[PDB]
Design a protein around this ligand. Structure first.
Ligand SMILES: [Mg+2]
Ligand SMILES: [Mg+2]
Ligand SMILES: [Mg+2]
Ligand SMILES: [Mg+2]
Ligand SMILES: [Mg+2]
Ligand SMILES: [Mg+2]
Ligand SMILES: [Mg+2]
Ligand SMILES: [Mg+2]
Ligand SMILES: [Mg+2]
Ligand SMILES: [Mg+2]
Ligand SMILES: [Mg+2]
Ligand SMILES: [Mg+2]
Ligand SMILES: [Mg+2]
Ligand SMILES: [Mg+2]
Ligand SMILES: [Mg+2]
Ligand SMILES: [Mg+2]
Ligand SMILES: [Mg+2]
Ligand SMILES: [Mg+2]
Ligand SMILES: [Mg+2]
Ligand SMILES: [Mg+2]
Ligand SMILES: [Mg+2]
Ligand SMILES: [Mg+2]
Ligand SMILES: [Mg+2]
Ligand SMILES: [Mg+2]
Ligand SMILES: [Mg+2]
Ligand SMILES: [Mg+2]
Ligand SMILES: [Mg+2]
Ligand SMILES: [Mg+2]
Ligand SMILES: [Mg+2]
Ligand SMILES: [Mg+2]
Ligand SMILES: [Mg+2]
Ligand SMILES: [Mg+2]
Ligand SMILES: [Mg+2]
Ligand SMILES: [Mg+2]
Ligand SMILES: [Mg+2]
Ligand SMILES: [Mg+2]
Ligand SMILES: [Mg+2]
Ligand SMILES: [Mg+2]
Ligand SMILES: [Mg+2]
Ligand SMILES: [Mg+2]
Ligand SMILES: [Mg+2]
Ligand SMILES: [Mg+2]
Ligand SMILES: [Mg+2]
Ligand SMILES: [Mg+2]
Lengths: 76, 51, 64, 96
RNA sequence: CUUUAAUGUUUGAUGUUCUAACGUUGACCCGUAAUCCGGGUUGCGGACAGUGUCUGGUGGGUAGUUUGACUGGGGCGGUCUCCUCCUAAAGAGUAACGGAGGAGCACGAAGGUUGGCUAAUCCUGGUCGGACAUCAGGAGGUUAGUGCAAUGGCAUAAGCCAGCUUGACUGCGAGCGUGACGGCGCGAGCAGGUGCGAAAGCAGGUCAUAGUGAUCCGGUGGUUCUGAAUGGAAGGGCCAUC
RNA sequence: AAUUCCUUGUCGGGUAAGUUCCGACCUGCACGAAUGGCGUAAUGAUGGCCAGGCUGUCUCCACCCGAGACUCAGUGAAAUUGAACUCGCUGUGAAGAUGCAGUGUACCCGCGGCAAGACGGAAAGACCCCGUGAACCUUUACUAUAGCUUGACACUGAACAU
RNA sequence: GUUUAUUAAAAACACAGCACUGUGCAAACACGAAAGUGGACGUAUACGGUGUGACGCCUGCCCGGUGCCGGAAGGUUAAUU
RNA sequence: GUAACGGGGCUAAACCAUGCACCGAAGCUGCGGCAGCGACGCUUAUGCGUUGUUGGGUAGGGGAGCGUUCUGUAAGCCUG
RNA sequence: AGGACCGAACCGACUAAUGUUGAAAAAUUAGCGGAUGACUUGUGGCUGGGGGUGAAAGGCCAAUCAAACCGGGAGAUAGCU
RNA sequence: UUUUGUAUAAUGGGUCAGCGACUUAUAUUCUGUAGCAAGGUUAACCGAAUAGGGGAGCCGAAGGGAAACCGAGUCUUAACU
């Protein structure tokens, strides 16, 4: 039947890019699935939000046999 | 919808109660679960009652 | 004549030490079973009135 | 308080608390107010006479606010932990 | 007393009658050379009728009003909140009566944990048995599955099974995201108590993102609060919840 | 059809030629019996149609008699008006130009005439939409209410039965 | 016959006639918080309301809905107690 | 009403290519002047002197003034 | 005899032209309908504003009536110009 | 004047002269300025009447908590890293 509907934009995406200094707890990426996976010092929330578990620099990296994206936190 | 609100009351004597829903048709038996009672500060058995 | 206070406003806001206003959170009156314990727990303590809303509150409470 | 029609902030938010009738007849005394009474004795009638507290005040507390230089006798007034130390240090006395 | 009849009394119910309240828009007398009124007589009615206060029904006769917005004018039709994808110009956000769909629930397990397991589809063979049921092998490699729309995820599975279970914990919360605001979301860690595991550990519901309703008023339970002379109490507050 | 959309229905009549009229048919979009049906003599400043007479209604206007218009004398208004040294054309431009551009034309000023234009004058569009405007009107909109109606108590008593 | 005095004179209104219906007289109905009055110094061959509209020939079927009239057994039901 | 180069006219006064001249604005420069904001000074009572820079503007905000009537200064001052 | 016929007065108002800063805030001229009747008219009386009166047109109620005029609430309110 | 935009053929004005629209009161906050300063200021009224008297009050030097209450802290919670 008729169209006309759409939902509110969920403001997902990368909140802190590579090199950015973050304090423990800071959301690095809001995503729907695990487009990025949690690496060293990075936690994964119930809505697959990746967050900092320790103060430091955001590091993006491709690891493993499945060539997956990982967000980690390097000490600064 | 076809699911009703029910209260789980503390057996510890304290007025404390948890609140949940129940499908009264499919599951007619009274719901029993061990839950934390913040008045006695211990895990006691809780039993279903009407909301 | 004396300015009259917005009596309903004076029943919801209270002036704090540094000039601000404290208020109770919305969404904790009824329909509480579906609401998560976490959500309800954060809604219990009083809160401060935001920057955008102080002008409105101050206009309603000239004797605050 | 009008916002164009949107439920105003003084309506979106819930009401809270109640007014204590006791608080209206309860006052607070600064240590700076003890020296201001004529007599070296601080009681409800003395402060009232010294215009420190109102006629209708039935209860008073001495708080650690300001300084106490002279020895004074506080009678029938509640005193805070800090104000007790302050009154006593200046050679004062605290009685019920 | 077992039970039954009948004379006295109390308040009811029902009927019949009475006169004295009350009605008379029958006749007469007087005030009075007056079709008003008043007093009187008489007849007819009569505790009815009627009126006051209260009460249910009826009541456009009268009255006050309401009777939405968006919109390639308006009206008709459609739409109004929420979720998913595209439009959207490789951060976020981004419009139209643009293109497509879905929600207003479900689940005490479909939740937690420990241990295990791995689809779709095609080819070959096989009682009934067929294009397709169940069985065996091979190819295949997640195209399956996910309670439901879409998109992103998912093998260390988030998919499927079992044992034990109640973390679908209570108090909090460094730090963040997202909002004009009200709000909404994510969160390691701390305290108390708990389940599972030998242990490291994991658990503050469900792969994630819809499944919703501010305030007021009122209800129920609890409560070191308040309690208009005082002690109580009513009512109010606070916590939980409808 | 005072009713029929399709529709100038079809057929007949009348006319040289008739979307109207008269007669008929029935396929009545959507007649119909006191919301009256179908007739009906008479009546009608009532609607439709035809004919004789009659004519300047018309072909197509002519002439003539009077009242204005025109000239002189006396009196003496009006609406309107930002300011005017107030032309045509094509184009431009709040998109329909005396006023802009280009070009053309035109010696200065009246009087009688005409109405193509000055989006001419008059009236803060009556259509249309809008305003959480107004009014009056309707009803099984909402809320009240007069009136009507019901019971209870009061004014309101007695006796006797069952 | 009447009508939109001032853009509508008509097919509109009225009309005699017909029907329905109310009304027993202190009538129904109407003006009046009332008193008083109209109806009527009339009395059902009268008076009010509604419709139809001389006259001729006539006026069929339907009571489900809405409105009205009648019914009292049961169900529900106010003040009051 | 020419009316589809603005016109005249043009065989370049059109088009393409290379080059040098010039014209051209309230832009830039020159000369003179005023003000806002800085800064620094011959040297501060808060002005002046230097000097860099700025100086289109509706709604709107800010700053500084003019003039009018009336009161005091004023039985003063001006004026037959 | 007759809401009978023709037709002046009288009552009306069907058509046309003129007039439309009029002679006139509804007329003039030529024609038109009624003209013993539900006729026409003088004087006086009565009915009053959600009220009257209406052979019904929302007509009329002192030159604009789907609610008269005057004064008051009153500087109603005007998210409009 | 209104507009995205007006020489506009959109509004308004025939012309001149005089008049014609952000006021006043009481609250309240902020800026400037003046007085006094952990204080500041009085209201009615009295009056010797712009003086002086009057400190009733109001604001400020204390907050936190719904409140009891505690107090440079307090609330939250059994307790807070
Ligand atoms: Mg509550
Ligand atoms: Mg005092
Ligand atoms: Mg009675
Ligand atoms: Mg009643
Ligand atoms: Mg009704
Ligand atoms: Mg009405
Ligand atoms: Mg009103
Ligand atoms: Mg609309
Ligand atoms: Mg993007
Ligand atoms: Mg982009
Ligand atoms: Mg699952
Ligand atoms: Mg495992
Ligand atoms: Mg096979
Ligand atoms: Mg163990
Ligand atoms: Mg008492
Ligand atoms: Mg008491
Ligand atoms: Mg015919
Ligand atoms: Mg002349
Ligand atoms: Mg012009
Ligand atoms: Mg015009
Ligand atoms: Mg207009
Ligand atoms: Mg006639
Ligand atoms: Mg007329
Ligand atoms: Mg006429
Ligand atoms: Mg009729
Ligand atoms: Mg019939
Ligand atoms: Mg009945
Ligand atoms: Mg040429
Ligand atoms: Mg060249
Ligand atoms: Mg320049
Ligand atoms: Mg410039
Ligand atoms: Mg006659
Ligand atoms: Mg005539
Ligand atoms: Mg005749
Ligand atoms: Mg005649
Ligand atoms: Mg008269
Ligand atoms: Mg009409
Ligand atoms: Mg008023
Ligand atoms: Mg006005
Ligand atoms: Mg426009
Ligand atoms: Mg221009
Ligand atoms: Mg103009
Ligand atoms: Mg004008
Ligand atoms: Mg002037």
């Amino acid at each position: 039947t008729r169209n006309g509907r759409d939902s509110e934009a969920k403001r997902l995406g990368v909140k802190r890019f590579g090199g950015e200094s973050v304090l423990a707890g800071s959301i690095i990426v809001r995503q729907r699935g695990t487009k990025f996976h949690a690496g060293a010092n990075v936690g994964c929330g119930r809505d697959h939000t990746l967050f900092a578990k320790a103060d430091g620099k955001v590091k993006f990296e491709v690891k493993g046999p499945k060539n997956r994206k990982f967000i980690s936190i390097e000490a600064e | 919808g076809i699911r009703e609100k029910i209260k789980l009351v503390s057996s510890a004597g304290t007025g404390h109660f948890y609140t949940t829903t129940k499908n009264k048709r499919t599951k007619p038996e009274k719901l029993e679960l061990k839950k934390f009672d913040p008045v006695v500060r211990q895990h006691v058995i809780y039993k279903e009652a009407k909301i | 004549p004396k300015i009259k206070t917005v009596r309903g406003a004076a029943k919801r806001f209270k002036k704090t030490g540094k000039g601000g206003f404290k208020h109770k959170h919305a969404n904790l009156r009824h329909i509480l079973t579906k609401k998560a314990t976490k959500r309800k727990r954060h809604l219990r303590p009083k809160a401060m009135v935001s920057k955008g809303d102080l002008g409105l509150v101050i206009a309603c409470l000239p004797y605050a | 308080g009008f916002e164009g029609g949107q439920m105003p902030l003084y309506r979106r938010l819930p009401k809270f608390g109640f007014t204590s009738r006791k608080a209206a007849i309860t006052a607070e005394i600064r240590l700076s107010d003890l020296a201001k009474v004529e007599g070296g004795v601080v009681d409800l009638n003395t402060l009232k006479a010294a215009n420190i507290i109102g006629i209708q005040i039935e209860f008073a507390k001495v708080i650690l606010a300001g300084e106490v230089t002279t020895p004074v006798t506080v009678r029938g007034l509640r005193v805070t932990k800090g104000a007790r130390a302050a009154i006593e240090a200046a050679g004062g006395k605290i009685e019920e």
